[PDB]
Design a protein around this ligand. Structure first.
Ligand SMILES: [Mg+2]
Ligand SMILES: [Mg+2]
Ligand SMILES: [Mg+2]
Ligand SMILES: [Mg+2]
Ligand SMILES: [Mg+2]
Ligand SMILES: [Mg+2]
Ligand SMILES: [Mg+2]
Ligand SMILES: [Mg+2]
Lengths: 196, 238, 115
RNA sequence: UUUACUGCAGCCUGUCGUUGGGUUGUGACGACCCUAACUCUGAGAAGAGGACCCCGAUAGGUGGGCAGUUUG
RNA sequence: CAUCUCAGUAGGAGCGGGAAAAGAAAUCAAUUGAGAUGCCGUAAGUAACGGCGAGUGAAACCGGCACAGUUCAAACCGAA
């Protein structure tokens, strides 16, 4: 088993409760809770995950940690007449996942980049921290980079807000094909939102 | 949706129910002192605090920090105020209650150490130091509860100045109106039976009556918890 | 673990310099792990200033069960410079000691002695 | 409007997560002690609580506070 | 009339271009086959759902418009 060290990082992060990642988790969440909603970091907390998701060690790529509240879409009780099925909102969690929420907040704070992907990095009772990869589509290195130069196209600006990232496509019910995607692909809006 | 109660309007925070915060002299709290530190100060004047209708003492300390203080009874101009554990147990002094002898009167008591003073602050109220223990100390509060406080909770020795303020009957709606001008409270208040049923739970009917028991449960929702809230009992002492 | 002597760390740094001059060295955590697994690690130097900790946290037990001695360097700037680069290097692996083989084996003896 | 019908907020409480370490009493349960997460105070040194509370989810209750209806 | 329907409609917030989304199977089939996606016709008011009430309601096969396939992570090399 001549395995790269990225494999060892992935092994350490496969079951993080029963590895050395638990000690680092207890030491790291103290610093992470104090930080802001969208915090920039030097290196990704899990380098193998970022590299498989598309991170490269070059300028014009930014990695940011985002804190998102745990739980579903907290909603307001309606103050006007509802038919008793559209009146209850405590047991309603929306169609926006927390990963999409974190990606959209990272895209909001960093307007001149694009959200590439993101991955779970840690969590506690009240928060979920996600590390979001962003790309600079106007840096010359990304312009020259042929494996990232698709992002310079006009159709790629606003990926995380048009549901084009991997968490976005998962949330739009496009992880699979065949049966079950009769009302999701090619878009939720195409079938009057009946899928999802 | 029958109209929200006066308590819900007050909790929303409208100008009718907001305190006129610009009228008040200053927030009252004990001076900030580091642990194992002390400061002296002298009274430069007894003023009038509109927030409490009682006097407050303007104290100039040794570091030059002019700080308004809650005035205990008997404090005068040119008196020296001392703070810290090493401060003598004297009226007007700020000391821990763990050094105060049992049976003394204290006021402006702190809930926690270095709190600034929460309990015993109305005009004339006081507390009694009951017992001393290693981790605790008992103080008999103005209500009557034997509250257990930390031994390091500071307090100013003596009863709060302005005692006897409620002895005078109001005697006139204008006098209470003028007091309530500087308050946050709503004046005058309409009885709930006189309201229509949309406004209060107790309103409505051909004749003034609640129609339902005035003792409401503790588990009532907001906008229903009126009347006698969660009463152990009712009526005068039979 | 017993803390290694500072003189032993200095000898390991000079051994890395001489290996760079004469023999073969694998600089970086990826190449260090490959050299450890393949069975060529004459000496493994680790940096104690890694962030995140998952970069070189596997190197210790892996080298310990692959029979390759390891040493902990204080931080990675002089590890990178001593390993011939102007950047950091979280670990370097010595797989061909060259003309510094005897100092490397004495370093291994001292590491096992104070192990 | 209500002890009409069906619900929905709020509130109360069990369980899971947040959530750790040692001790006894039992076969994982209850209590006790600690600081180290966490909470509150202060500009901070630090002080007070502390694996409780708050919070996410789930189960039951109360619930004209509120909604939609019925009342041939 | 409450599940349902009205209807994911009306309305709202974000993003965005001349188009956008989709897109090259962890697919659909049936005993053996096909070979990215979109859109059109049909399957069909059929399967399916439903106080099995009122109503809602596809896809595959198939016939067409148009035809397009690939790039990363990793193994090995190591600044090339
Ligand atoms: Mg924000
Ligand atoms: Mg496209
Ligand atoms: Mg009412
Ligand atoms: Mg009603
Ligand atoms: Mg209706
Ligand atoms: Mg625009
Ligand atoms: Mg695609
Ligand atoms: Mg429908």
């Amino acid at each position: 088993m001549v395995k790269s060290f990225y494999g060892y990082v992935r092994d350490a992060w496969k079951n993080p409760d029963e590895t050395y990642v638990n000690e680092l988790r207890w030491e790291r969440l103290q610093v992470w809770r104090k930080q802001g909603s969208v915090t920039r970091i030097e290196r990704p907390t899990r380098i193998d995950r970022a590299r498989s998701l598309g991170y490269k060690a070059k300028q014009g790529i930014v990695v940011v940690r985002v804190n998102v509240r745990r739980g579903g879409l907290g909603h307001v009780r309606p103050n006007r007449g509802r038919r008793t099925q559209k009146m209850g909102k405590n047991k309603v969690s929306g169609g926006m996942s927390i990963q999409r929420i974190a990606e959209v907040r990272a895209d909001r704070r960093y307007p001149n980049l694009e959200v590439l992907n993101s991955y779970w990095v840690g969590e506690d009772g009240k928060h979920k921290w996600f590390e979001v990869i962003l790309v600079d589509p106007h840096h010359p290195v990304i312009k020259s980079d042929k494996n990232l130069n698709w992002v310079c196209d006009p159709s790629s600006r606003g990926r995380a807000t048009r549901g084009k990232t991997s968490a976005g496509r998962k949330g739009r019910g496009m992880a699979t094909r065949g049966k079950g995607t009769e009302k999701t692909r090619p878009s939720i809006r195409a079938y009057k939102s009946r899928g999802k | 949706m029958g109209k929200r109660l006066i308590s819900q309007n007050r909790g929303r925070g409208t100008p009718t129910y907001r305190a006129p915060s610009h009228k008040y002299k200053a927030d009252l709290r004990h001076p900030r002192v580091d642990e194992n530190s002390s400061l002296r100060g002298e009274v430069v004047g007894i003023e009038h605090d509109p927030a409490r209708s009682a006097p407050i003492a303007k104290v100039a300390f040794e570091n030059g920090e002019e700080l308004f203080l809650l005035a205990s009874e008997g404090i005068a101009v040119g008196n020296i105020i001392e703070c810290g554990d090493d401060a003598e147990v004297k009226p007007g002094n700020i000391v821990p209650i763990g050094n105060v002898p049992e049976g003394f009167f204290i006021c402006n008591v702190e809930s926690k150490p270095n709190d600034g003073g929460k309990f015993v602050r109305s005009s004339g109220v006081y507390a009694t130091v009951v017992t001393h223990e290693a981790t605790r100390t008992a103080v008999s509060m103005p209500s009557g509860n034997i509250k257990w406080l930390n031994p390091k909770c500071r307090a100013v020795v003596g009863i709060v100045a302005g005692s006897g303020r409620v002895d005078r009957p109001w005697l006139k709606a204008g006098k209470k109106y003028h007091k309530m001008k500087t308050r946050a409270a709503k004046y005058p208040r309409v009885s709930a039976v006189a309201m229509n049923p949309r406004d209060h739970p107790f309103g409505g009917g051909a004749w003034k009556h609640p129609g339902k028991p005035t003792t409401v449960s503790r588990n009532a929702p907001p906008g229903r918890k009126v009347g006698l809230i969660a009463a152990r009992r009712t009526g005068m002492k039979r | 673990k017993f803390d290694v002597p500072e003189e032993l760390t200095n000898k390991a740094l000079e051994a890395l310099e001489l290996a760079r001059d004469t023999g073969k060295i694998k600089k970086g955590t990826n190449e260090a792990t490959k050299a450890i697994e393949r069975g060529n690690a004459k000496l493994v130097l680790i940096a104690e200033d890694i962030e995140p900790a998952e970069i070189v946290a596997h190197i210790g037990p892996l080298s310990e069960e692959k029979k390759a001695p390891y040493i902990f360097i204080k931080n990675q700037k002089e590890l990178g410079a001593a390993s011939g680069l102007g950047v950091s290097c979280a670990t370097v692996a010595i797989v061909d000691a060259g003309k510094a083989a005897e100092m490397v084996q004495d370093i291994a003896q001292k590491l096992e002695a104070l192990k």
